[PDB]
């Protein structure tokens with residue numbers, strides 16, 4: 001109840017305007033600030049207690065950001081477009097030692113989005129579902145977070161079927177990229193923790209903070 | 215087309231009749247044989263080229279087995295029931311050093327299944343969707359595997375809405391446990407690789423084989 | 429902890 | 440590779 005897809009699309013339109021690994025880390029930090037504003041624009045999000053708001057963002061920021069730049073990379077050839085306006089080509093990522101994860105992103109996310117022509121309203125809802133992760137540990141009221149997630153995909157399914165009547169399986173197809181996003185999200189994090197350990201590759205304050213405990 | 219849920223339920227009914235970590239590893243090996251027979255009973259599975267059949271099973275065996283013993287642990291108090299007829303209590307897992315992952319299994323999987331009263335037909339379809347992972351690397355025909363996945367959840371959604379008309383969001387709720395299954399599946403694997411490295415904790419041939427490359 | 433995050437969420 | 444798996448799938 002009260003989870004209009006129009007508001008979700010607005011949040012998206014509101015935020016969306018040499019070592020390839022270093023450029024990626026900088027883009028991630030830059031986007032972390034934009035992620036918070038985006039979240040505040042998501043219905044009922046800011047109404048949750050500040051603490052659960054922190055738990056939800058710290059728990060999904062990576063999947064949220066990955067989903068965003070991936071959808072933003074549909075038109076791109078073999079690579080991704082960073083929020084900084086930089087392009088990371090598949091070969092460049094390979095020459096940096098992160099080719100494997102980069103390929104999964106292009107194969108399981110970017111390409112799949114481009115193939116089904118996932119629109120911005122759909123991207124938004126998926127990110128909204130990720131944001132509202134009822135499994136996030138520490139939640140003062142997981143049941144409430146769960147209720148919000150259900151209102152989101154309920155509206156998403158409504159959006160679909162209505163805009164894509166000829167594709168009765170589109171709703172499930174969108175939801176079925178989450179397992180891949182979750183898997184790719186976990187691998188990118190492992191790499192990040194390694195980059196921090198090694199000391200090389202600059203990491204800004206906000207990104208660094210996300211690597212803090214828990 | 216030709217993906218009846220009755221056949222899926224049959225596959226389930228056909229296979230379903232001191233260190234807690236050691237008992238878990240043995241149960242996993244025992245179930246790996248039962249997993250293959252279960253798969254063969256899944257419509258169109260055995261019709262795929264032997265190689266893609268190997269790729270699909272090696273890619274999802276862990277999530278497939280986890281989903282199974284979890285649903286089998288709904289009636290159980292704070293723990294799980296192993297196929298060997300053994301019970302692993304939450305405290306026992308904790309005293310073995312695997313309490314964290316064990317808690318995620320009880321919190322994100324077992325409890326959620328028990329709360330929504332997920333039936334065997336639903337479990338089956340979800341496992342069938344996991345089995346038919348179009349993202350599995352090496353697939354000679356990923357598009358075909360994708361087509362099978364879509365026929366599975368298309369039938370699942372039909373099963374739902376019809377059996378649970380009063381729960382219009384049940385279909386999405388089932389699909390939304392996959393991200394958790396994928397995450398928990400990846401963590402259990404990490405533990406297994408560690409157990410192998412350490413050398414302690416016996417590991418049988420079949421389970422050992424699944425830890426082989428790739 | 430999470431200095432930056434809290435400050436941004438609160439504003 | 441995957442001796443056991445192939446043998447079981449083939450039977």
Ligand SMILES: CC(=C/C=C/C(C)=C/C(=O)O)/C=C1\CCCc2cccc(C)c21
Nearest residue numbers: 027028062065069082083098188191192
């Ligand atoms: C966690 C993460 C966030 C991405 C943020 C970006 C790049 C946002 C944006 O530009 O919109 C992904 C990283 C960040 C650090 C590790 C990594 C390695 C290979 C490829 C990628 C995309 C990554």
Ligand SMILES: CC(=C/C=C/C(C)=C/C(=O)O)/C=C1\CCCc2cccc(C)c21
Nearest residue numbers: 241242276279283296297312402405406
């Ligand atoms: C990969 C995996 C498979 C489970 C197989 C079982 C237990 C099947 C069954 O009894 O039906 C899970 C493992 C197997 C090894 C690592 C591990 C650690 C803590 C808890 C669990 C469940 C696990």
